[PDB]
mmCIF file of C-alpha atoms in Angstrom:
data_model
loop_
_atom_site.group_PDB
_atom_site.id
_atom_site.type_symbol
_atom_site.label_atom_id
_atom_site.label_comp_id
_atom_site.label_asym_id
_atom_site.label_seq_id
_atom_site.Cartn_x
_atom_site.Cartn_y
_atom_site.Cartn_z
ATOM 1 C CA UNK A 1387 0.107 -0.095 -0.130
ATOM 2 C CA UNK A 1388 1.368 3.808 -1.707
ATOM 3 C CA UNK A 1389 1.098 7.433 -1.941
ATOM 4 C CA UNK A 1390 2.297 8.995 -5.156
ATOM 5 C CA UNK A 1391 5.192 12.573 -4.285
ATOM 6 C CA UNK A 1392 5.876 14.945 -6.720
ATOM 7 C CA UNK A 1393 9.149 14.711 -7.268
ATOM 8 C CA UNK A 1394 9.211 18.512 -5.737
ATOM 9 C CA UNK A 1395 8.319 17.042 -2.502
ATOM 10 C CA UNK A 1396 11.200 15.319 -1.990
ATOM 11 C CA UNK A 1397 14.339 15.070 0.028
ATOM 12 C CA UNK A 1398 17.224 13.116 1.462
ATOM 13 C CA UNK A 1399 16.232 11.214 3.737
ATOM 14 C CA UNK A 1400 12.522 10.676 2.857
ATOM 15 C CA UNK A 1401 11.257 7.116 3.193
ATOM 16 C CA UNK A 1402 10.446 5.537 -0.750
ATOM 17 C CA UNK A 1403 9.704 2.382 -2.831
ATOM 18 C CA UNK A 1404 12.413 2.005 -5.132
ATOM 19 C CA UNK A 1405 12.553 -1.800 -7.198
ATOM 20 C CA UNK A 1406 9.644 -3.050 -5.186
ATOM 21 C CA UNK A 1407 11.493 -1.727 -1.689
ATOM 22 C CA UNK A 1408 11.553 0.732 1.632
ATOM 23 C CA UNK A 1409 14.422 2.719 1.077
ATOM 24 C CA UNK A 1410 15.919 5.625 3.036
ATOM 25 C CA UNK A 1411 16.719 8.436 -0.754
ATOM 26 C CA UNK A 1412 20.883 8.760 0.515
ATOM 27 C CA UNK A 1413 21.077 10.756 -3.194
ATOM 28 C CA UNK A 1414 19.461 12.333 -6.240
ATOM 29 C CA UNK A 1415 20.170 13.416 -9.276
ATOM 30 C CA UNK A 1416 18.511 14.193 -12.538
ATOM 31 C CA UNK A 1417 19.028 12.622 -16.230
ATOM 32 C CA UNK A 1418 19.905 14.770 -18.610
ATOM 33 C CA UNK A 1419 18.936 12.912 -21.284
ATOM 34 C CA UNK A 1420 15.453 12.811 -20.246
ATOM 35 C CA UNK A 1421 15.237 15.194 -17.442
ATOM 36 C CA UNK A 1422 13.056 11.984 -14.683
ATOM 37 C CA UNK A 1423 14.791 11.808 -11.458
ATOM 38 C CA UNK A 1424 16.909 9.380 -9.972
ATOM 39 C CA UNK A 1425 16.845 8.381 -6.494
ATOM 40 C CA UNK A 1426 19.870 6.363 -4.771
ATOM 41 C CA UNK A 1427 18.139 4.088 -1.482
ATOM 42 C CA UNK A 1428 18.718 2.392 1.296
ATOM 43 C CA UNK A 1429 16.399 -0.884 1.512
ATOM 44 C CA UNK A 1430 15.034 -0.588 4.852
ATOM 45 C CA UNK A 1431 15.411 -3.666 5.521
ATOM 46 C CA UNK A 1432 18.201 -5.515 3.667
ATOM 47 C CA UNK A 1433 21.209 -2.569 3.945
ATOM 48 C CA UNK A 1434 21.120 -2.780 -0.126
ATOM 49 C CA UNK A 1435 20.826 -0.353 -2.617
ATOM 50 C CA UNK A 1436 18.440 0.719 -4.561
ATOM 51 C CA UNK A 1437 17.960 3.070 -7.563
ATOM 52 C CA UNK A 1438 14.993 3.793 -9.278
ATOM 53 C CA UNK A 1439 13.549 6.707 -11.954
ATOM 54 C CA UNK A 1440 11.057 9.126 -11.749
ATOM 55 C CA UNK A 1441 7.750 8.345 -13.688
ATOM 56 C CA UNK A 1442 6.779 10.807 -15.961
ATOM 57 C CA UNK A 1443 2.529 11.797 -16.891
ATOM 58 C CA UNK A 1444 0.799 13.621 -18.209
ATOM 59 C CA UNK A 1445 -2.717 14.269 -16.499
ATOM 60 C CA UNK A 1446 -3.514 17.404 -18.886
ATOM 61 C CA UNK A 1447 -1.985 19.588 -21.198
ATOM 62 C CA UNK A 1448 0.817 21.776 -19.265
ATOM 63 C CA UNK A 1449 1.162 19.663 -16.521
ATOM 64 C CA UNK A 1450 3.560 17.387 -16.472
ATOM 65 C CA UNK A 1451 4.342 15.863 -13.057
ATOM 66 C CA UNK A 1452 7.199 13.499 -11.617
ATOM 67 C CA UNK A 1453 6.725 10.781 -9.510
ATOM 68 C CA UNK A 1454 7.957 8.288 -7.280
ATOM 69 C CA UNK A 1455 6.287 5.817 -4.802
ATOM 70 C CA UNK A 1456 5.992 6.399 -0.448
ATOM 71 C CA UNK A 1457 4.693 3.850 2.031
ATOM 72 C CA UNK A 1458 2.234 4.156 3.505
ATOM 73 C CA UNK A 1459 2.412 3.893 7.426
ATOM 74 C CA UNK A 1460 0.956 2.073 9.491
ATOM 75 C CA UNK A 1461 0.571 3.376 13.459
ATOM 76 C CA UNK A 1462 0.781 0.929 16.195
ATOM 77 C CA UNK A 1463 0.181 2.061 19.956
ATOM 78 C CA UNK A 1464 3.189 0.258 21.708
ATOM 79 C CA UNK A 1465 2.251 -2.419 24.914
ATOM 80 C CA UNK A 1466 5.702 -4.155 26.235
ATOM 81 C CA UNK A 1467 9.470 -3.339 25.337
ATOM 82 C CA UNK A 1468 11.424 -6.560 25.491
ATOM 83 C CA UNK A 1469 14.378 -7.472 24.539
ATOM 84 C CA UNK A 1470 15.226 -5.174 20.635
ATOM 85 C CA UNK A 1471 11.511 -5.394 20.053
ATOM 86 C CA UNK A 1472 7.837 -4.159 21.039
ATOM 87 C CA UNK A 1473 4.507 -6.013 21.590
ATOM 88 C CA UNK A 1474 1.783 -3.596 19.461
ATOM 89 C CA UNK A 1475 -1.065 -3.400 18.363
ATOM 90 C CA UNK A 1476 -2.781 -2.493 15.823
ATOM 91 C CA UNK A 1477 -5.984 0.086 17.113
ATOM 92 C CA UNK A 1478 -9.014 -2.753 15.588
ATOM 93 C CA UNK A 1479 -7.158 -4.414 18.762
ATOM 94 C CA UNK A 1480 -4.515 -7.149 17.191
ATOM 95 C CA UNK A 1481 -1.387 -7.860 19.209
ATOM 96 C CA UNK A 1482 1.586 -7.449 17.438
ATOM 97 C CA UNK A 1483 3.615 -10.266 19.953
ATOM 98 C CA UNK A 1484 7.782 -8.866 19.066
ATOM 99 C CA UNK A 1485 8.357 -6.189 16.316
ATOM 100 C CA UNK A 1486 11.039 -5.626 15.686
ATOM 101 C CA UNK A 1487 12.564 -1.985 15.764
ATOM 102 C CA UNK A 1488 14.747 -0.471 13.133
ATOM 103 C CA UNK A 1489 18.494 0.143 14.280
ATOM 104 C CA UNK A 1490 18.148 3.853 13.408
ATOM 105 C CA UNK A 1491 19.090 7.157 14.288
ATOM 106 C CA UNK A 1492 18.343 5.473 18.055
ATOM 107 C CA UNK A 1493 15.490 4.598 17.423
ATOM 108 C CA UNK A 1494 15.282 2.326 20.171
ATOM 109 C CA UNK A 1495 16.417 4.634 23.349
ATOM 110 C CA UNK A 1496 13.786 8.333 21.897
ATOM 111 C CA UNK A 1497 11.179 5.360 22.117
ATOM 112 C CA UNK A 1498 12.249 3.672 25.661
ATOM 113 C CA UNK A 1499 12.165 7.014 26.198
ATOM 114 C CA UNK A 1500 8.565 8.070 26.233
ATOM 115 C CA UNK A 1501 8.014 4.581 26.578
ATOM 116 C CA UNK A 1502 9.082 4.463 30.318
ATOM 117 C CA UNK A 1503 7.199 8.328 30.714
ATOM 118 C CA UNK A 1504 3.847 9.038 28.827
ATOM 119 C CA UNK A 1505 2.906 5.202 27.502
ATOM 120 C CA UNK A 1506 -0.451 5.214 27.285
ATOM 121 C CA UNK A 1507 0.970 7.430 23.694
ATOM 122 C CA UNK A 1508 3.413 6.652 22.417
ATOM 123 C CA UNK A 1509 3.496 5.318 19.209
ATOM 124 C CA UNK A 1510 5.506 3.306 16.100
ATOM 125 C CA UNK A 1511 4.689 3.971 12.596
ATOM 126 C CA UNK A 1512 5.201 0.881 10.770
ATOM 127 C CA UNK A 1513 6.496 0.173 7.458
ATOM 128 C CA UNK A 1514 4.715 -3.406 5.525
ATOM 129 C CA UNK A 1515 8.143 -5.249 3.136
ATOM 130 C CA UNK A 1516 5.896 -8.565 1.616
ATOM 131 C CA UNK A 1517 4.441 -9.246 4.712
ATOM 132 C CA UNK A 1518 7.352 -8.538 7.222
ATOM 133 C CA UNK A 1519 6.350 -5.165 9.264
ATOM 134 C CA UNK A 1520 9.074 -2.993 11.372
ATOM 135 C CA UNK A 1521 8.458 0.168 13.210
ATOM 136 C CA UNK A 1522 10.375 2.766 11.987
ATOM 137 C CA UNK A 1523 10.121 6.534 13.858
ATOM 138 C CA UNK A 1524 7.464 6.746 16.492
ATOM 139 C CA UNK A 1525 5.202 9.762 17.486
ATOM 140 C CA UNK A 1526 2.785 11.206 21.123
ATOM 141 C CA UNK A 1527 -0.919 11.619 20.704
ATOM 142 C CA UNK B 1305 -6.530 22.298 -9.244
ATOM 143 C CA UNK B 1306 -4.903 20.760 -6.320
ATOM 144 C CA UNK B 1307 -2.409 17.985 -5.463
ATOM 145 C CA UNK B 1308 -2.489 15.820 -1.887
ATOM 146 C CA UNK B 1309 0.799 16.413 -0.574
ATOM 147 C CA UNK B 1310 1.696 13.992 3.186
ATOM 148 C CA UNK B 1311 2.873 16.301 5.615
ATOM 149 C CA UNK B 1312 5.874 14.683 6.562
ATOM 150 C CA UNK B 1313 7.187 15.878 3.342
ATOM 151 C CA UNK B 1314 6.058 19.407 3.550
ATOM 152 C CA UNK B 1315 9.653 21.582 4.794
ATOM 153 C CA UNK B 1316 10.380 25.497 4.838
ATOM 154 C CA UNK B 1317 9.820 26.665 1.692
ATOM 155 C CA UNK B 1318 7.659 24.688 -0.195
ATOM 156 C CA UNK B 1319 4.712 26.677 -1.854
ATOM 157 C CA UNK B 1320 0.938 25.564 -0.704
ATOM 158 C CA UNK B 1321 -2.367 26.189 -0.985
ATOM 159 C CA UNK B 1322 -3.111 28.047 2.469
ATOM 160 C CA UNK B 1323 -7.028 28.424 3.416
ATOM 161 C CA UNK B 1324 -8.246 29.324 -1.330
ATOM 162 C CA UNK B 1325 -4.344 30.958 -1.144
ATOM 163 C CA UNK B 1326 -0.747 30.032 -2.869
ATOM 164 C CA UNK B 1327 1.962 30.816 0.279
ATOM 165 C CA UNK B 1328 5.480 30.033 0.583
ATOM 166 C CA UNK B 1329 5.184 28.349 3.539
ATOM 167 C CA UNK B 1330 7.867 30.985 6.500
ATOM 168 C CA UNK B 1331 6.735 28.661 9.747
ATOM 169 C CA UNK B 1332 5.817 25.353 10.686
ATOM 170 C CA UNK B 1333 4.999 24.252 13.891
ATOM 171 C CA UNK B 1334 2.340 21.745 16.213
ATOM 172 C CA UNK B 1335 -0.438 21.563 17.656
ATOM 173 C CA UNK B 1336 -0.724 20.483 21.810
ATOM 174 C CA UNK B 1337 -4.364 19.863 21.480
ATOM 175 C CA UNK B 1338 -4.974 18.213 18.546
ATOM 176 C CA UNK B 1339 -1.283 17.478 16.994
ATOM 177 C CA UNK B 1340 -2.357 18.909 13.364
ATOM 178 C CA UNK B 1341 -0.150 21.570 11.819
ATOM 179 C CA UNK B 1342 -0.194 24.175 10.976
ATOM 180 C CA UNK B 1343 1.883 26.071 8.632
ATOM 181 C CA UNK B 1344 1.959 30.012 8.058
ATOM 182 C CA UNK B 1345 2.327 31.240 4.558
ATOM 183 C CA UNK B 1346 3.083 34.391 2.368
ATOM 184 C CA UNK B 1347 0.655 34.700 -0.384
ATOM 185 C CA UNK B 1348 2.267 34.163 -3.741
ATOM 186 C CA UNK B 1349 0.222 37.588 -4.668
ATOM 187 C CA UNK B 1350 -0.810 39.604 -3.014
ATOM 188 C CA UNK B 1351 2.400 39.690 0.590
ATOM 189 C CA UNK B 1352 -0.219 38.971 2.988
ATOM 190 C CA UNK B 1353 0.458 36.111 5.498
ATOM 191 C CA UNK B 1354 -2.121 33.242 5.761
ATOM 192 C CA UNK B 1355 -2.334 30.101 8.364
ATOM 193 C CA UNK B 1356 -3.550 26.379 8.526
ATOM 194 C CA UNK B 1357 -3.834 23.719 10.331
ATOM 195 C CA UNK B 1358 -3.718 19.932 8.136
ATOM 196 C CA UNK B 1359 -6.767 17.293 7.655
ATOM 197 C CA UNK B 1360 -6.785 14.532 9.586
ATOM 198 C CA UNK B 1361 -8.105 11.029 7.471
ATOM 199 C CA UNK B 1362 -8.421 7.415 8.904
ATOM 200 C CA UNK B 1363 -8.935 5.941 4.927
ATOM 201 C CA UNK B 1364 -8.616 2.559 6.982
ATOM 202 C CA UNK B 1365 -7.642 1.007 10.590
ATOM 203 C CA UNK B 1366 -4.113 1.780 11.604
ATOM 204 C CA UNK B 1367 -3.620 4.553 9.596
ATOM 205 C CA UNK B 1368 -4.156 8.252 10.284
ATOM 206 C CA UNK B 1369 -2.390 10.840 7.185
ATOM 207 C CA UNK B 1370 -2.248 14.730 7.428
ATOM 208 C CA UNK B 1371 -2.389 16.020 4.196
ATOM 209 C CA UNK B 1372 -2.445 19.701 2.695
ATOM 210 C CA UNK B 1373 -3.076 20.796 0.168
ATOM 211 C CA UNK B 1374 -0.229 22.329 -2.957
ATOM 212 C CA UNK B 1375 -0.945 24.039 -6.921
ATOM 213 C CA UNK B 1376 -0.821 21.609 -9.675
ATOM 214 C CA UNK B 1377 2.192 23.954 -11.504
ATOM 215 C CA UNK B 1378 1.508 24.133 -15.041
ATOM 216 C CA UNK B 1379 4.427 23.539 -18.029
ATOM 217 C CA UNK B 1380 5.499 27.182 -20.319
ATOM 218 C CA UNK B 1381 7.606 27.594 -23.330
ATOM 219 C CA UNK B 1382 9.129 31.045 -22.893
ATOM 220 C CA UNK B 1383 8.713 32.859 -26.693
ATOM 221 C CA UNK B 1384 10.508 35.940 -25.390
ATOM 222 C CA UNK B 1385 11.015 38.146 -23.019
ATOM 223 C CA UNK B 1386 9.651 42.170 -21.749
ATOM 224 C CA UNK B 1387 9.808 44.271 -19.135
ATOM 225 C CA UNK B 1388 8.879 42.601 -16.283
ATOM 226 C CA UNK B 1389 6.923 40.337 -18.425
ATOM 227 C CA UNK B 1390 7.003 37.325 -20.776
ATOM 228 C CA UNK B 1391 5.555 35.991 -23.913
ATOM 229 C CA UNK B 1392 4.428 32.188 -22.616
ATOM 230 C CA UNK B 1393 2.824 29.404 -24.789
ATOM 231 C CA UNK B 1394 1.165 26.574 -23.935
ATOM 232 C CA UNK B 1395 1.517 22.934 -25.024
ATOM 233 C CA UNK B 1396 -1.775 23.965 -26.944
ATOM 234 C CA UNK B 1397 -0.035 26.318 -28.665
ATOM 235 C CA UNK B 1398 -2.422 29.380 -26.392
ATOM 236 C CA UNK B 1399 0.081 32.147 -26.833
ATOM 237 C CA UNK B 1400 -0.164 34.398 -23.259
ATOM 238 C CA UNK B 1401 1.385 37.627 -24.701
ATOM 239 C CA UNK B 1402 2.112 39.486 -20.419
ATOM 240 C CA UNK B 1403 2.693 37.357 -18.441
ATOM 241 C CA UNK B 1404 4.265 38.594 -15.055
ATOM 242 C CA UNK B 1405 7.755 36.972 -13.181
ATOM 243 C CA UNK B 1406 6.823 36.464 -9.770
ATOM 244 C CA UNK B 1407 10.426 38.332 -7.209
ATOM 245 C CA UNK B 1408 11.487 35.760 -6.015
ATOM 246 C CA UNK B 1409 14.985 34.626 -6.004
ATOM 247 C CA UNK B 1410 16.449 36.728 -8.457
ATOM 248 C CA UNK B 1411 14.792 33.940 -10.357
ATOM 249 C CA UNK B 1412 13.883 37.409 -13.765
ATOM 250 C CA UNK B 1413 18.124 36.436 -14.238
ATOM 251 C CA UNK B 1414 18.774 33.208 -13.756
ATOM 252 C CA UNK B 1415 15.853 33.088 -16.523
ATOM 253 C CA UNK B 1416 17.495 35.846 -18.437
ATOM 254 C CA UNK B 1417 20.197 33.727 -18.775
ATOM 255 C CA UNK B 1418 19.129 30.828 -19.508
ATOM 256 C CA UNK B 1419 16.963 32.619 -22.162
ATOM 257 C CA UNK B 1420 19.457 33.167 -24.552
ATOM 258 C CA UNK B 1421 21.681 30.784 -23.669
ATOM 259 C CA UNK B 1422 18.867 28.245 -24.818
ATOM 260 C CA UNK B 1423 15.389 29.923 -25.587
ATOM 261 C CA UNK B 1424 14.063 26.715 -27.401
ATOM 262 C CA UNK B 1425 14.414 24.738 -23.577
ATOM 263 C CA UNK B 1426 13.482 27.157 -20.866
ATOM 264 C CA UNK B 1427 10.484 26.669 -19.700
ATOM 265 C CA UNK B 1428 8.632 28.256 -17.008
ATOM 266 C CA UNK B 1429 5.979 26.374 -13.835
ATOM 267 C CA UNK B 1430 2.815 28.523 -13.225
ATOM 268 C CA UNK B 1431 0.340 28.808 -10.430
ATOM 269 C CA UNK B 1432 -2.777 30.154 -11.024
ATOM 270 C CA UNK B 1433 -4.923 32.076 -8.638
ATOM 271 C CA UNK B 1434 -8.478 32.109 -9.710
ATOM 272 C CA UNK B 1435 -8.095 33.189 -12.792
ATOM 273 C CA UNK B 1436 -4.557 35.580 -11.839
ATOM 274 C CA UNK B 1437 -1.657 33.745 -13.667
ATOM 275 C CA UNK B 1438 1.816 34.038 -12.801
ATOM 276 C CA UNK B 1439 6.073 32.138 -13.442
ATOM 277 C CA UNK B 1440 7.052 30.904 -10.331
ATOM 278 C CA UNK B 1441 10.064 29.086 -10.624
ATOM 279 C CA UNK B 1442 12.109 27.314 -14.984
ATOM 280 C CA UNK B 1443 13.102 24.601 -16.078
ATOM 281 C CA UNK B 1444 14.738 22.998 -18.731
ATOM 282 C CA UNK B 1445 14.625 20.701 -21.369
#
């Protein structure tokens, strides 16, 4: 499940879908030949590099837009924290016992400190990869 | 005519629709009470300040997204440059004799230098405001 993002709203560090994989963009360039944009990114799950060029479209006369796809993040409540995993619950009560937390920008520690102070309103943002789920950021409500 | 942009892809300097007006965002904050984002922007045409808070939606369980609207930019060919205006043509051959160029980041000079060297492939990106059109950026093909 994905959203369309115009290329002028894509900056380094964004998470895009490259070659069907969730990736963190580390380099943006432009093709001289076509004017497409080329995004080099790091697979959030495998840590391999993927590249993909933007999709050009013409929905109307005088309207050219380049887009990439970005993931739809799910929001889960945090019920408990174990060794490197968490117990999450979807907002329909579906419990996920060992959701992994990505090692990126000390997410575990930020999350721990926020769970200590106020567990009721900690949320994790979660990406899916062909079934595998992983938490990649946090929010507070 | 507008596109939906997720709030995590909105940074200072982006052009958003605030209160129905095209604006350049100069400050982003978050409401404690609701978690919406609040965007303070400068009307591209009047130079007045407008603010507007994000729209929250729930398209699916465990999926919360905040969005703002952004304009759809049209792309026009540049046929000639006058005193502060340009002659543009849409890609269906509709000629616009005095399209104004916004004074923002020396757009006129960047545009002039690019029109001197290679007029065939200079384009302007144009926003509409209830009929009034204005060029706000340039591209080269």
